[PDB]
Amino acid sequence: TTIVSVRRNGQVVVGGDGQVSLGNTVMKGNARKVRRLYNGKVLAGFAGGTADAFTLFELFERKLEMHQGHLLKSAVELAKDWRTDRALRKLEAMLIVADEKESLIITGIGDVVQPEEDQILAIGSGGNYALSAARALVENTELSAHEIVEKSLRIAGDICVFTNTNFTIEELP
Amino acid sequence: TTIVSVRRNGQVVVGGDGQVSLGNTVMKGNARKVRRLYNGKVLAGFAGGTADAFTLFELFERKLEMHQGHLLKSAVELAKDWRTDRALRKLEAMLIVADEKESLIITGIGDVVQPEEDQILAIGSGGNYALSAARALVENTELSAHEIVEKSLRIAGDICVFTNTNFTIEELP
Amino acid sequence: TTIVSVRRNGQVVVGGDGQVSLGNTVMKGNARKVRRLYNGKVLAGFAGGTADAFTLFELFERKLEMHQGHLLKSAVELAKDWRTDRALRKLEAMLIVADEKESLIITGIGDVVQPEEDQILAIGSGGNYALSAARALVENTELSAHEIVEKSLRIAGDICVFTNTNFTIEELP
Amino acid sequence: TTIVSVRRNGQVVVGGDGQVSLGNTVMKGNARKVRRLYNGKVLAGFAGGTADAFTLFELFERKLEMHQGHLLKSAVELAKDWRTDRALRKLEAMLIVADEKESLIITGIGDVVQPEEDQILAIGSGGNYALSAARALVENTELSAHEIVEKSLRIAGDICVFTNTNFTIEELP
Amino acid sequence: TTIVSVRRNGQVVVGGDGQVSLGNTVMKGNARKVRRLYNGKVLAGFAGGTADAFTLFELFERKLEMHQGHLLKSAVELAKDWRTDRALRKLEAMLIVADEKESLIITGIGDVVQPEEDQILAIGSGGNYALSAARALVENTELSAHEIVEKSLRIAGDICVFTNTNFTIEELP
Amino acid sequence: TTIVSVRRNGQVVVGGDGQVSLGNTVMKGNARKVRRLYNGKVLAGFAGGTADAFTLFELFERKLEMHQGHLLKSAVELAKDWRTDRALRKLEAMLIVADEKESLIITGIGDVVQPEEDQILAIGSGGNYALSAARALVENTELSAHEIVEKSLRIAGDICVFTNTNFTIEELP
Amino acid sequence: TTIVSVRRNGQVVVGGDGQVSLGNTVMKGNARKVRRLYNGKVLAGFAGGTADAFTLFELFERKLEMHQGHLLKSAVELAKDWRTDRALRKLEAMLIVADEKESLIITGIGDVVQPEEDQILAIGSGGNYALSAARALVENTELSAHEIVEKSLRIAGDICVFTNTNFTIEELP
Amino acid sequence: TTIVSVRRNGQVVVGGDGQVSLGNTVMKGNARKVRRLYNGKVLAGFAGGTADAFTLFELFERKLEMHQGHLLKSAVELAKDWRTDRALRKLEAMLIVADEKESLIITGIGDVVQPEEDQILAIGSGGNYALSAARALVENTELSAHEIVEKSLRIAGDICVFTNTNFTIEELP
Amino acid sequence: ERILTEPHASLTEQYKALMATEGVNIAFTTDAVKKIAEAAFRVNEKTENIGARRLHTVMERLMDKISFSASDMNGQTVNIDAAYVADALGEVVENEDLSRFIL
Ligand SMILES: [Mg+2]
Ligand SMILES: [Mg+2]
Ligand SMILES: [Mg+2]
Ligand SMILES: [Mg+2]
Ligand SMILES: [Mg+2]
Ligand SMILES: [Mg+2]
Ligand SMILES: [Mg+2]
Ligand SMILES: [Mg+2]
Secondary structure (H helix, E strand, O other): OOEEEEEEOOEEEEEEOOOEEEOOEEEEOOOOOEEEEOOOOEEEEEEEOHHHHHHHHHHHHHHHHHOOOOHHHHHHHHHHOOOOOOOOOOOOEEEEEEOOOOEEEEEOOOOEEOOOOOOEEEEOOOHHHHHHHHHHHHOOOOOOHHHHHHHHHHHHHOOOOOOOOOOEEEEEO | OOEEEEEEOOEEEEEEOOOEEEOOEEEEOOOOOEEEEOOOOEEEEEEEOHHHHHHHHHHHHHHHHHOOOOHHHHHHHHHHOOOOOOOOOOOOEEEEEEOOOOEEEEEOOOOEEOOOOOOEEEEOOOHHHHHHHHHHHHOOOOOOHHHHHHHHHHHHHOOOOOOOOOOEEEEEO | OOEEEEEEOOEEEEEEOOOEEEOOEEEEOOOOOEEEEOOOOEEEEEEEOHHHHHHHHHHHHHHHHHOOOOHHHHHHHHHHOOOOOOOOOOOOEEEEEEOOOOEEEEEOOOOEEOOOOOOEEEEOOOHHHHHHHHHHHHOOOOOOHHHHHHHHHHHHHOOEOOOOOOOEEEEEO | OOEEEEEOOOOEEEEEOOOEEEOOEEEEOOOOOEEEEOOOOEEEEEEOOHHHHHHHHHHHHHHHHHOOOOHHHHHHHHHHHHOOOOOHHHOOOEEEEEOOOOEEEEEOOOOOEOOOOOOEEEEOOOHHHHHHHHHHHHHHOOOOHHHHHHHHHHHHHHHEOOOOOOOOOEOOO | OOEEEEEOOOOEEEEEOOOEEEOOEEEEOOOOOEEEEOOOOEEEEEEOOHHHHHHHHHHHHHHHHHOOOOHHHHHHHHHHHHOOOOOHHHOOOEEEEEOOOOEEEEEOOOOOEOOOOOOEEEEOOOHHHHHHHHHHHHHHOOOOHHHHHHHHHHHHHHHEOOOOOOOOOEOOO | OOEEEEEEOOEEEEEEOOOEEEOOEEEEOOOOOEEEEOOOOEEEEEEEOHHHHHHHHHHHHHHHHHOOOOHHHHHHHHHHOOOOOOOOOOOOEEEEEEOOOOEEEEEOOOOEEOOOOOOEEEEOOOHHHHHHHHHHHHOOOOOOHHHHHHHHHHHHHOOEOOOOOOOEEEEEO | OOEEEEEOOOOEEEEEOOOEEEOOEEEEOOOOOEEEEOOOOEEEEEEOOHHHHHHHHHHHHHHHHHOOOOHHHHHHHHHHHHOOOOOHHHOOOEEEEEOOOOEEEEEOOOOOEOOOOOOEEEEOOOHHHHHHHHHHHHHHOOOOHHHHHHHHHHHHHHHEOOOOOOOOOEOOO | OOEEEEEEOOEEEEEEOOOEEEOOEEEEOOOOOEEEEOOOOEEEEEEEOHHHHHHHHHHHHHHHHHOOOOHHHHHHHHHHOOOOOOOOOOOOEEEEEEOOOOEEEEEOOOOEEOOOOOOEEEEOOOHHHHHHHHHHHHOOOOOOHHHHHHHHHHHHHOOEOOOOOOOEEEEEO | OHHHHOOOOOHHHHHHHHHHHOOOEEEEOHHHHHHHHHHHHHHHHHOOOOOOHHHHHHHHHHOHHHHHHHHHOOOOEEEEOHHHHHHHOOOOOOOOOOOOOOO
């Protein structure tokens, strides 16, 4: 799995592959690993255990709902459930969430992290492959955030055996 | 164990082998790994731990009963029991369920997955062997869904040591 | 990660690197691993699991609040929560805390330890590297506590692969 | 380590970082991992112990004589012995060679590998990161084969904790 | 063990602790780990079994003859054989050599390593600690190359449980 | 860590080293591993996990308080908390306790053991080293119990890498 | 096994237990682990298979000829071959040699080790226990070098479960 | 540890060694592993974890008390506490219990076993060694049950490294 | 210092009236009040902080003696000044131990 997000020119994109693999064999190549939350105004992409990912996703959605859908605050409250005595079971998955304001990556262990400057996030086995292609594309091109995402995902896919070419790209106008 | 399902021409089939093996020794070769649920209007085939499989099966049946027997909704509610804090123990088994509308595979870890296009599912150690023979048979033949299932199971059986030739094929008129 | 603290000339400093690494790959190089607590009158730096560190930090802050912000007493009460029957889950992280009076290092296993004489503490993978450079700098130089910290961190960073050069140094006037 | 090679416009470039690590600590940052061979006619890069490399660089000279400076003939030969000669399977490393008509990679395992229609090769723990950057840069930019390698090393070095910034770029002619 | 070397003002010094351990117990504290070689023209230090060392010290004498007392030529050669000669890869150790123009480190794995513009080298479990002390001392003090090595051993020996205080400092000339 | 106790001539002594080590590196060399309990009328020395030791110590102190400070009875009641169904978590540490009447060693697993005849106890990694030196000293010398303890600890320290020379000796007049 | 050597007043003694174990069971209790070599001029003790020893005892005779009965010269030589000769690294054992001017220990790994200003050496699982007893006895008593070894074996044998009480003390002259 | 029991001529004996060992080192050689229960009318000997043994012993004693001290019934009720849903933690120890009527061995896992014919029981590491010597002694001698026990224990002790010669033999007139 | 005297029915006014009952006449000097307040603020700061309640704890520890002997001192007048307070309020609460748990 590969998920990457780029934010430039007042545009936010988050896309990912579609390959679902059981061991060293593929099961499905058309999975949607990026979806819209909170009245379709926040982008979310997940990686890791198929079940753990969905539960991390779902848990986060409940949060957005208990707040005015504020990405940051929500991320922080969800992560707080891991920073207590009640050892809330950990999930072997990761999420990339974004909207018109910020972009974050949240993990099933309980921590939130923000970009760096070029507003680029990437998770999954193929993450760092799309990450490089994107950093490169951003510091040397004028390509749209939507173009960078598709181009980097493809690259990543040609390197990682668990990342295919069936993308699902969501952008927030 | 090998279980495969094909859906074509308004016909749905789900069949499987009969070999039950303890370690590298066979115990029984006439097991029925495919059975009918909800007033015999939904097909279900299981693979994995003998006990875990039956409990996954049973748990699913209770679901169909608490709903109007809707395959999808049922699958989603059962899977939801794994996507919460109460770490509902995981089962080392898998189910293939189908009816006049859809076909799904459900796992003891908590996720539901749908086919791809050719409406073909397969689980178990011998799964991918029957899977190929079936994809092949479907994209190059006019054979019935019932014929494809029997032919692919046989093939799978001649390759996997844990898959025999004592089939149990159920189809939904 | 590398965190070191020096206390000399009525001055207390605590600084650390900024590299956050997932496995053998860097994720972020601008993290703030040293922060101010209790009305910004106590310095704290952490190392270890990103989530475990924050929870160790947070747990300690609640303590300072339940007391008049007394470093020692707080450290001792927090550590007491591990010295009972209720096996308060252990955290894989460590903290360096200091103020105008004392400097301590607290671990997620439940123990508090004080310096030795030269009032120098250091934790993390790169700890002992900054530690040596500092002991050396303190027993053979007239450099400020603020200068020693920056110089030792840099050194440590040139040796440990998980320690970068993006420092965050806090001192208590 | 990261060694990347890019051929664009009769220009063949090969650059690499200069970090030598012993476990998780830096031993040397200013290292030459790309040497000029066969009377400055064949530039090569290694990813392993310099001695291991030197032993194989001298041996590639020999094989390049048995055959008329044919990089490929000489290469395919080396790998045929590296795996058969018991003394050679002792030396573990990655090799990249370029001259004027083609680029290659020699492994102590599999064997020679030629570039795609992009003319780019990369080895070392950070290789795939540099590869991803390059492949994007060469497909969306007009940057020189030298300005590309330049950037790709920076990108990789920033993600891999075993790669630095001291580059040894060897152009040609 | 800890062997450190510092060159400052035409002065090249090499000192080391004297502890010989068998597992977690001390076997000998007064050991010489730095010997004078090539007619007292080349001082060397080892980090391994004395026998292993002696076998390699005598062999460095030989290689230093094939070439005109060129420390580097002789060194690069030794490591080329240490890894190729099946009998030499039996001897595991670290080597440090200095004479009058340069200092080096020979490994039974990678290969030769030259100092940075600081002219300092260190090996042994406590090496990196001594290295950290030195690098700080040589960049902030005017202490002699001998008074530095002196201190660095003390610092390292106090952190490493496999290093003691009986030093064998060999200056030059 | 090394702790030993000798009882002769109506005198009881219990002493120990001061080295606190994290892995193969020392952290502090001036720790007090022997302390006075119950109005300073009972000697106690501990070894093992820094946190487990303190909790074993603390748990024992509460006992002395709930009784008239009777060493034996207290030891037996504390150990009883491990000999029940409620699997009171085990502590990876050991204690040596003594007073004007008896000397015992208590473990975090739940058992109490008495000397043998020469009234000598010793625990920790360096225990048996001080133990021998003491048995020897007691069956062939007229040295005070206070002299035997210091002399044996020193010996032990020169053998075990986790035992230093910074002793803390307590005796009960 | 426990072999200890003590030199006091022109008197050099070497004694050892006599237990031969196979795993956790006794195979033989009356064994000679100290033999007289070089025409009763060099007493030696081994800690390993007698055959392994005999093979090395005969070989120490040879090396003691190449050089004028110089125990050290002969020793340092043996260890130089024990580690280099592929057939010798097959034999695992510990060796202790004494004659009239010095005592030594030969290892199939590191290499020769000379006593401190105390003139005492010990090998075997119980070695360090005997060592501790001796070092105390020789520093606080006037007991003969023979009455010391005597006692030290008793002490060690009582702590080590792989050492017994049948001693083979070889004095000299 | 070794414990054996013989019943002949209206006499019942149960004896055992006294060696208490921590790892491969002895701690105490005078332990009483055989004791009298229920108004001193039932013999009990234990083996295994020092703490687990005492808790198995203690648990059994409470039983005898809740019944008229009937060995069999008591053994069966104690074992019943392991044959339920409440997974009563298992103890790594074993007991040999006897009186004027029967002889049994009870384990910390929950099962009771009776002799065979010659009324001989034996547990511990050295068990089967004393067992053979006893079977032999019983099927070929007229020696008292008290004589057989002492003689077999001694034998066992000369074979097992964890079994000494400090016996404690109890017999029921 | 102000809570001690200003408020209607302050602690100083209460003790004055209580002792007056036994025929004793007491008077707190400005310096005395100031030390009572410093001590109170001092222990709330080094140990457990209970606010103005601490004043009650300290006064009681201070009026300990007179409260007992008041019946035997009728007609007299007592002057609670700096010295009287420094004697009554001994020296520094009680230790500050805590390193007993530290390594
Ligand atoms: Mg792919
Ligand atoms: Mg088959
Ligand atoms: Mg670094
Ligand atoms: Mg890097
Ligand atoms: Mg040391
Ligand atoms: Mg030591
Ligand atoms: Mg023994
Ligand atoms: Mg024995």
